[PDB]
Amino acid sequence: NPVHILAKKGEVAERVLVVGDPGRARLLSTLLQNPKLTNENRGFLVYTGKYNGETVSIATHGIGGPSIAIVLEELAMLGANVFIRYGTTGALVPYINLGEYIIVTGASYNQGGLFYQYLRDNACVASTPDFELTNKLVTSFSKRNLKYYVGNVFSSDAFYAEDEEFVKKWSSRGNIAVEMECATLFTLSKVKGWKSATVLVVSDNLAKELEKSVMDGAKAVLDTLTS
Amino acid sequence: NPVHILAKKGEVAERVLVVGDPGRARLLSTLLQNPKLTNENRGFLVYTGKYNGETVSIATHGIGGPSIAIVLEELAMLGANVFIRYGTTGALVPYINLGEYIIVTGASYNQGGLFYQYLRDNACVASTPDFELTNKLVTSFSKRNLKYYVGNVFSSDAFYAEDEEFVKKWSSRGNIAVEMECATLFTLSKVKGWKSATVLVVSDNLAKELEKSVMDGAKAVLDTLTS
Amino acid sequence: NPVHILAKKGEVAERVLVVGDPGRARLLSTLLQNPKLTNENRGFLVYTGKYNGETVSIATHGIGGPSIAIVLEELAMLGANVFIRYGTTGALVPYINLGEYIIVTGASYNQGGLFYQYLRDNACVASTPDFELTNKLVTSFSKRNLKYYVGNVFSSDAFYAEDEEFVKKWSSRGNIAVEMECATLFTLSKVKGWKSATVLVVSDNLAKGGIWITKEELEKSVMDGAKAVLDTLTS
Amino acid sequence: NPVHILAKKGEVAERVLVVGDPGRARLLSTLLQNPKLTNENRGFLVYTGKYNGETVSIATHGIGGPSIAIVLEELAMLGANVFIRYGTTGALVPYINLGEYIIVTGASYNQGGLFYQYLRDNACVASTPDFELTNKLVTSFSKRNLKYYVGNVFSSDAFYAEDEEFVKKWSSRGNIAVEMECATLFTLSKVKGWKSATVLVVSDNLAKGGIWITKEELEKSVMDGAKAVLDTLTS
Amino acid sequence: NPVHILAKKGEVAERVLVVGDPGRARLLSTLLQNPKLTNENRGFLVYTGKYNGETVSIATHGIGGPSIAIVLEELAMLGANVFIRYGTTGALVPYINLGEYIIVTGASYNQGGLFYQYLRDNACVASTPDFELTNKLVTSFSKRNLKYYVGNVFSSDAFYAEDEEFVKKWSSRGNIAVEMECATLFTLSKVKGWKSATVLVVSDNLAKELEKSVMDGAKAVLDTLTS
Amino acid sequence: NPVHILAKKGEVAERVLVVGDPGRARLLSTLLQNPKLTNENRGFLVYTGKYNGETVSIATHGIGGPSIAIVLEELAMLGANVFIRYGTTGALVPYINLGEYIIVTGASYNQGGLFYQYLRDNACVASTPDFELTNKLVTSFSKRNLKYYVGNVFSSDAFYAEDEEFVKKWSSRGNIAVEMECATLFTLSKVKGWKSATVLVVSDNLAKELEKSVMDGAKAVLDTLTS
Numbered sequence A, B, E, F: 001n002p003v004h005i006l007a008k009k010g011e012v013a014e015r016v017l018v019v020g021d022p023g024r025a026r027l028l029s030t031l032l033q034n035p036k037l038t039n040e041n042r043g044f045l046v047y048t049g050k051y052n053g054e055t056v057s058i059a060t061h062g063i064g065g066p067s068i069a070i071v072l073e074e075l076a077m078l079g080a081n082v083f084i085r086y087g088t089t090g091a092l093v094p095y096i097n098l099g100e101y102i103i104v105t106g107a108s109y110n111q112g113g114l115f116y117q118y119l120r121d122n123a124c125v126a127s128t129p130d131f132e133l134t135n136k137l138v139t140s141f142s143k144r145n146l147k148y149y150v151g152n153v154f155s156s157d158a159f160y161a162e163d164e165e166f167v168k169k170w171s172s173r174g175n176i177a178v179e180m181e182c183a184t185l186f187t188l189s190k191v192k193g194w195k196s197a198t199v200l201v202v203s204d205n206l207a208k209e210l211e212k213s214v215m216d217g218a219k220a221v222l223d224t225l226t227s
Numbered sequence C, D: 001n002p003v004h005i006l007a008k009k010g011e012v013a014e015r016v017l018v019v020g021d022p023g024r025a026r027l028l029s030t031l032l033q034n035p036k037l038t039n040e041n042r043g044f045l046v047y048t049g050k051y052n053g054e055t056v057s058i059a060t061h062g063i064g065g066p067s068i069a070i071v072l073e074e075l076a077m078l079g080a081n082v083f084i085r086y087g088t089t090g091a092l093v094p095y096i097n098l099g100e101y102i103i104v105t106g107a108s109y110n111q112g113g114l115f116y117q118y119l120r121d122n123a124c125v126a127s128t129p130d131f132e133l134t135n136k137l138v139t140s141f142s143k144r145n146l147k148y149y150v151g152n153v154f155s156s157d158a159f160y161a162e163d164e165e166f167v168k169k170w171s172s173r174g175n176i177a178v179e180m181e182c183a184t185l186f187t188l189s190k191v192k193g194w195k196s197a198t199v200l201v202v203s204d205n206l207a208k209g210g211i212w213i214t215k216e217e218l219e220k221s222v223m224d225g226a227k228a229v230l231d232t233l234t235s
């Protein structure tokens, strides 16, 4: 029995759009038909409504692997099995501009903690999203003529430990942006059998309005989610 | 400049009581004189008021090491340097009862992400609270005739990876309870030069109402913070 | 200058089909127009010719991460920058039949050795193939009406290492097959800037040792797949 | 049965003051009433007598984690369960003068063999002394008007290992001194169920190699502190 | 049934000289009496014949730990139990000249996959050759009046990641040369009960005629194997 | 200036026989000509005298890697450069009887602090003795008709954590006995340029005359040191 998200079974859809910021969940709920607040416990706002004749929920996951792991596990216990994370990220390469999008194809991460507790050892398990769902995202973002890039990201655990040596190291490893929850989402999804994907809004560039960019892409994500 | 906690510098006190649940922050603010909401961005509610002739803030830190690390770093950037975490925990031994308290003397943890990024290697740095501040807590709880225990806790990163083997392993290692933020709080405080401590309310017992226990202990915590 | 693959300037194409078995490299070369043996030093056979009127090369990479790492580095020094591995694999799930194909989307691996020397620490860098090239492969195989599955694989370093929980461990982690070079191929490519992808022919099923197939049916599978792969490299 | 400390039933007290130097164990035994040598095998001297009308023992633990682990395990088999280590240390901060004292609140350490063998994995288990016993030491030292500091220490395994940033590294991590046995003492105690604490006499300052102390002044410091320690052990 | 070395049962000797290069195996087979090619699959050439009235085989092992592991395992399944590797190496000390020989007494290695899969943990198991067999090699080489040095070598997994800082680091760790298969050979042999050793021909010096060297040594090696 | 071994410069020989037990050091000193005690500090007894027309020292190293490292370092600062450890060990194979000897060819060890502090990373550096010195030991024990076995040993750090699962694990990894200082001695010697070896007396057999045995062996050891 979930102890963080206090929604009743049947109040959470199988399809869920997950965001870190409670405020974004509230803003994006205005895109659903007849949205209802199914949970507010511990600040994790969850809204359930309709979109393209499909029931969908928008849920808050907070910051970090431990936080999103808990939210995903409990949403799953209430019926969810398809998740698409819509967050913000810091670009690691110069050519990507603010307000543009990144569709994630994989996540790099440092071993330990959460991963050791779930996997039982330090093996580097491929942290990747569902192949088909990610391709649908690309197709959806193209249909809407939105500027996007496709690549891997580094899921950091320490926001304030990202210096300059940091940027060169990670971009030289094939990552084009940094965020904090993708590796946990993809890996846990692989173990639990959930279908997940992620699209990010570039809010900063470490190598070198948000709300407007957020709204445009949210519609592309919702279309993908309900397709 | 902080991008999560949007409080104006000067609106955050040097002394801060930190809690994981936004709802508890709101509930505990009623114990302050003339409380003002100084931040609500991303759901991290921060209240600032007075207590026993001292300015004090009550801040939300969310769940997990990555989350509290961000909140502490930003509160510190706004002026804070003394932190006392007041959370909930699951007892790992049979004799501790629900509603009783645990004053923390140390935190065990699994190596990984956050710690590697801050410490730069995998050394096991002693994750302990400020000695003087912790003794003051013990004195305050005794004065108010509250039932407490003193011991180490295990700071877990995966709430849903805690099985049977789990309880015996950690209690046999000298830990009497499990929570998720103490190790990050103590270690980062040692590195940043902050004075930190922690008191926990037992909400569950893994070996074998909350609001009531929470309110009683909050006063002892605030007395300690303003002494 | 390369000390294993002794090829001269302009003899290696930019686009290369890489396989572990030199016997297969020779066999596949017969699908090209006027194939020329560019290298045979240390057994690493490399042929260069044309397909659909396009210049391409087929090279041998041997067994394991250390071997394919050396071959990829020297081939790139000779001018290559696009690599598609075409090999064999063992399925980790019961529903995949022998002779079918697996288009790789990522590779799991145990930390250490080669990765520590190249990456300088033990971070788990995402080991994935080029997004676009992989989708081209999916398109090519479906147009050839071939049966394939899409998923991650575990790149093992010890073919004969015992683990009474092997199949269950890796299959429970999202992997549908096991081989030995993909992690090295994908990670080294991300670090060096090469575009890589991988397609594997199921030559055995570890989750069901009851099934089997003969070379007549296997080589047949290898041949049909090579055509789809070559189409993609020439696209 | 113990194979290092050859003592009989009842020769070892429940409360034990442990020191690394057998020469110090002998010297300190003169503070007890009717001291009796209960062991001398392998150089690990153990004396048993009375202080303030209380039976206690002073034992030698040698240098390093592996050594003190063996000694503590055998002393416990002989009946001991309360241990207070009293040793020497090197300060990692400039403001601590030689001859002063450090009451340990925790110990930092590098993952390693000893801990892996006992813990069965590499988790960073909190290495802390008994809360109450440590507070008794603080009270005792202040009542004897002695200058002390409270803080964490780094338990090193390599006295002569080179590290250009040693002092800066550990002091920046909240440690004010370095020694070699505390982490093993605290962790093994938590695991076995013993009550332990530690008090150290600063015999050098790595953050200031300029200051020095003479043997007469030092032993003087050791003597004074030992009284406070013994008061606590017999409280 | 071995899937790489398809030699017939009885076609592989108990005594085996292993080399990484197929061409060297071919070239060395001319030192045997009545040599017959017993395997060609996957390029792993294996020849079997006689020398000093004893049956002996010369096998190709390819490049790297994973490759030699497979070959050794299958050769053993076919009856081999004594292995002597004859390869090339890069000197890490300036006093060793090209063409001279190095008789290995131990192998340094970085912890990694292969060792983890076979050992089941990160323990540093001593990677050493058979003591008696190694002394027989020393005798054979001095008897033929050859110039050799006895010492430890570093078994690298990444040929193209061995920069300059490389030389100082490994030479200061007691290693006088670098190659890529010795650690695997020695450790696997200790676990399986095989008797192994290694002699190397210096083909390069990273701190600072050939054909003849290879041939000269091969004869000293064959005498040892058949002693 | 060494702070543990207070011997005067010139009072310590270049050739040193090291033992863990102070009592054995005292006992073995009677084998030297005109033995003089050169150090007593901290219980680390050191005697110096002559044997076969050569200056030799017998030093106490205490128990464990950290202890022998300190002693070896200070003895070297005083002029020692050739070390031969003579200790006791527990056999890991049933065919080795009490009182017999084991000449060590290598040492297995678990990654740990001491090796990390000296090596600066987790690399498994070959922990082996000097090849020449070890062969001289074999010769010495043969000329005296003593029963010995050559093989690798496991250098444990936790004496009281050596259960039964223990025996099968290390014996299957090619180790024939367990002790506590060889890994440290061999690795530190390789890094420092010292020549070291080790002979052990089997005191116990975990798979299934300490006076007389020790004495008989010590003589073979002293002959080797002065050859």
Ligand SMILES: Nc1ncnc2c1ncn2[C@@H]1O[C@H](CO)[C@@H](O)[C@H]1O
Pocket (backbone or CB within 6 Å): A020, A062, A063, A064, A087, A088, A089, A090, A156, A159, A162, A178, A179, A180, A181, A203, A204
């Ligand atoms: N520069 C950045 N580094 C790490 N996370 C970032 C960054 N920019 C945005 N984020 C994302 O936004 C939140 C932190 O602001 C986290 O949930 C994280 O996923």
Ligand SMILES: Nc1ncnc2c1ncn2[C@@H]1O[C@H](CO)[C@@H](O)[C@H]1O
Pocket (backbone or CB within 6 Å): B020, B062, B063, B064, B087, B088, B089, B090, B156, B159, B162, B178, B179, B180, B181, B203, B204
């Ligand atoms: N059983 C438990 N395991 C881990 N954290 C717990 C437990 N009970 C309460 N907590 C604390 O409460 C939150 C999760 O409920 C986290 O912030 C954590 O610190």
Ligand SMILES: Nc1ncnc2c1ncn2[C@@H]1O[C@H](CO)[C@@H](O)[C@H]1O
Pocket (backbone or CB within 6 Å): C003, E020, E062, E063, E064, E087, E088, E089, E090, E156, E159, E162, E178, E179, E180, E181, E203, E204
């Ligand atoms: N400098 C070197 N570094 C690594 N391996 C080498 C070197 N020189 C020769 N080799 C050996 O030759 C092959 C690499 O050319 C491998 O099988 C390896 O054992």
Ligand SMILES: Nc1ncnc2c1ncn2[C@@H]1O[C@H](CO)[C@@H](O)[C@H]1O
Pocket (backbone or CB within 6 Å): D003, F020, F062, F063, F064, F087, F088, F089, F090, F156, F159, F162, F178, F179, F180, F181, F203, F204
């Ligand atoms: N069974 C054993 N396990 C570990 N060390 C042993 C054993 N037998 C003898 N020793 C050696 O003797 C001492 C422990 O009695 C240590 O110095 C160690 O090297």
